[PDB]
Design a protein around this ligand. Sequence first.
Ligand code: HEM
Ligand SMILES: CC(=O)[C@H]1CC[C@H]2[C@@H]3CC=C4C[C@@H](O)CC[C@]4(C)[C@H]3CC[C@]12C
Length: 464
Amino acid sequence: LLSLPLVGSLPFLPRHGHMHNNFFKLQKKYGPIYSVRMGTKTTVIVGHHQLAKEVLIKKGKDFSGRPQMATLDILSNNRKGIAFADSGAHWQLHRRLAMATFALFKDGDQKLEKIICQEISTLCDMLATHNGQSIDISFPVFVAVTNVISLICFNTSYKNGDPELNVIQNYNEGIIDNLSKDSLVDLVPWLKIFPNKTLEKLKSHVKIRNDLLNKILENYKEKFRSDSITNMLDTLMQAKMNSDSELLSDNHILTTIGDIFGAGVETTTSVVKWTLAFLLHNPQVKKKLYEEIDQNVGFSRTPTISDRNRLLLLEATIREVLRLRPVAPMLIPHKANVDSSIGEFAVDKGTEVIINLWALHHNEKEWHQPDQFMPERFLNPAGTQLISPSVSYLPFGAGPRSCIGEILARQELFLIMAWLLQRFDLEVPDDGQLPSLEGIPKVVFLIDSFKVKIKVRQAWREAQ
Ligand code: HEM
Ligand SMILES: CC(=O)[C@H]1CC[C@H]2[C@@H]3CC=C4C[C@@H](O)CC[C@]4(C)[C@H]3CC[C@]12C
């Protein structure tokens, strides 16, 4: 009477719970760092901030690779661009170019605060027409951030009603949906197991997206001139002519613009939706934010970047949203470029390594009541300045593969929330339904579409 032969073993049920939460629960049994193997591939899950900072910072270069995935190969055209590119010359080149591009908006007649505030005023006007109604603000916000990125990349933007915006929204939604079912970290490779159309569907969306990028590129090749470097595509093209020109082919440049448009639009739109959601569940915090803005900016002017020194609760709220609901609760998978180690455990070349950011932001030894939305935790006991209550906090990642849009992201988020609170009461709809805060884990941690009643504030109207 013997034990059964065991051909496979998994520690939890696939497709049951959010994987990032499942991995975190396993830490109780197994500690902050453990592995799983799928056939020949081995993946390592890291869940403590110290070990995470070893992988991301102290040994960044050792762990800066990206694993190959069938779906990411499609979206990135066989590993071009920045985000899904393996570490290497192509990756390093476009990455630095993209970062240098942000210097052309440091100030001057192309100031980032002004570009953003231009789109936000259009967004505000649009939303004012819905005065007294309940709406889903996904699309207006998406259009506003799409313009901002479009100005950074091409110095161009869309007029309201350009149906191209609906086209983009449509393939974005389709890409995000098919890129993964679960998180980007899929436990079992079901895609390569059962008959399915996922790759063909993803191809189809990626086709439409690429053909649109091709179109914009051929138009820009004729508008481009060496004496005017004002946007990202200039930088890529200026760099191509000075040139190792195999790293700056057409596909490379498109894939790069693709990632920039991708991350620029989807992440920022998502965090605004989450922020509005959390405020609808917390009228009291929302009350104090109105009081804060009314008493620090008033209705004599619009909010500006420099008001982030004054509106501290607004900055704390944004930080607390990125804690509870990180856009990428498992970053993007890393990969060991060389043989190495984490916490003095050996990690081989080619081993996939996921940072469970969700664990870092809910670690009970590092955060007081992690389950709770408490913007206060980012304010000194008085409320006079911001502080870092924990080092176990990495919403934008760190080291070599860290976010390159973080400042753009922080500022866009700050200004949208600041303007919106200045002009609008944002209440629960007359149906009384609150948004679900459970979320949907894709490559981005989406929130369910919900509605808000939007009303021009009486205090703003009086300002005439
Ligand atoms: C609230 C908004 C955002 C958040 C929370 C965020 C967070 C992150 C995270 C976690 C990563 C991956 C770090 C890693 O893989 O270790 C990342 C990577 C990246 N992000 Fe952001 N991001 C945001 C907005 C943006 C924006 C606005 C842009 C572009 C302007 C952008 C461009 C990128 C790119 C290109 C990468 C890949 C970097 C590489 O592999 O070298 N992100 N971001
Ligand atoms: C937050 C983050 O890490 C960013 C880095 C690159 C970003 C991706 C880059 C490209 C795309 C394709 C686009 O159509 C939709 C979003 C999507 C899939 C982005 C989602 C979020 C990603 C993964």
